[PDB]
Amino acid sequence: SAQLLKSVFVKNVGWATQLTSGAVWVQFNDGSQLVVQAGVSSISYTSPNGQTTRYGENEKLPDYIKQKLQCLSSILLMFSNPTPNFH
């Protein structure tokens, strides 16, 4: 079962939350909610009106969802541990 692992805030964007499963849940300050996970090619985007829409690997997305993904890639920098690995 996927537990919440780390929660991060981004001014003036929103909050992102990493889950155990490898998922990332962003809750934007415009009422939008992007959900993304490693291994899974699909992306679920919920809009301010409340509609949730799943999008597959080869589905043309509108700029409003591409912009939030660009942004999600930049939020992914805030959960990265830069400490070097040894042993």
Binding site: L5, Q18, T20, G22, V24, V36, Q37, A38, G39, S41, I43, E57, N58, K60, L61, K66, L69, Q70, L72, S73, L76, F79, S80, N81, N85
Partner: protein
């Protein structure tokens, strides 16, 4: 789960996410 094996795999799963979205953004540049 183990402390080393959990924390390494979570940062490994995060790296794969960044790359997946990076392919996706490029894939979109080719579409439709």
């Amino acid at each position: 789960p183990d402390a080393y094996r959990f924390l390494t795999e979570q940062d490994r799963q995060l790296r794969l996410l960044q790359a997946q979205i990076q392919r996706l953004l490029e894939a979109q540049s080719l579409m439709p």
